Amino acid sequence: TVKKIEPGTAADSQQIHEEKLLYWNMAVRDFSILINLIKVFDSHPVLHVCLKYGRLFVEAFLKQCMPLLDFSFRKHREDVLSLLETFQLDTRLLHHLCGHSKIHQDTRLTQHVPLLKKTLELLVCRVKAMLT
């Protein structure tokens, strides 16, 4: 579903902007709590699918969401700034989770670990790029 949501334009009216952007807002806050729910759950399949699919979720966030940060910037600045402050805390939490991923030393997880790490570098540099 997160691949499907497209960024519109800067000249889009606020209502269509807000519905698809509030879908993105609930998406990133869903992502934050989806990161927060991992600290209670176990059974390495859980962390395995986390390391599989969270990667492509944040890739969708690169290609689809942050173009809206670039596009609806001049008019609705406060909402997107609240959203980015929502995302920085889960970014530091993702640093903690990546630390948790490295410390277990699993052979099945470690094929897609370094690929997820390069995607982590990609997502953080994309966050810094579209904040400008």
From Swiss-Prot:
Subcellular location(s) per record: Nucleus
> What happens on changing S13A?
No effect on phosphorylation by ATM
Expressed, tissue-wise, as follows: Highly expressed in germinal center cells of the spleen, tonsil, and reactive lymph nodes, and in the proliferating basal layer of squamous epithelium of tonsil, esophagus, oropharynx, larynx and cervix. Expressed in cytotrophoblastic cells of the placenta and exocrine cells of the pancreas (at protein level). Highly expressed in testis, where expression is restricted to maturing spermatocytes.
Phosphoserine: which positions carry it?
Answer: S13
Subunit text: Homodimer; cannot be ubiquitinated and does not bind DNA. Part of a FANCI-FANCD2 heterodimeric complex that binds and scans dsDNA for DNA damage. Interacts directly with FANCE and FANCI. Interacts with USP1 and MEN1. The ubiquitinated form specifically interacts with BRCA1 and BLM. Both the nonubiquitinated and the monoubiquitinated forms interact with BRCA2; this interaction is mediated by phosphorylated FANCG and the complex also includes XCCR3. The ubiquitinated form specifically interacts with MTMR15/FAN1 (via UBZ-type zinc finger), leading to recruit MTMR15/FAN1 to sites of DNA damage.
Quote the disease note of the record: Fanconi anemia complementation group D2: A disorder affecting all bone marrow elements and resulting in anemia, leukopenia and thrombopenia. It is associated with cardiac, renal and limb malformations, dermal pigmentary changes, and a predisposition to the development of malignancies. At the cellular level it is associated with hypersensitivity to DNA-damaging agents, chromosomal instability (increased chromosome breakage) and defective DNA repair.
**Summary of the function given for this chain in its UniProt record:** Required for maintenance of chromosomal stability. Promotes accurate and efficient pairing of homologs during meiosis. Involved in the repair of DNA double-strand breaks, both by homologous recombination and single-strand annealing. The FANCI-FANCD2 complex binds and scans double-stranded DNA (dsDNA) for DNA damage; this complex stalls at DNA junctions between double-stranded DNA and single-stranded DNA. May participate in S phase and G2 phase checkpoint activation upon DNA damage.
Task: State the name under which the record lists this protein.
Answer: Fanconi anemia group D2 protein
Q: Which organism is it from?
A: Homo sapiens (Human)
The gene it comes from is FANCD2
Q: Which residues of the full protein are shown?
A: 1245 to 1376 of 1451
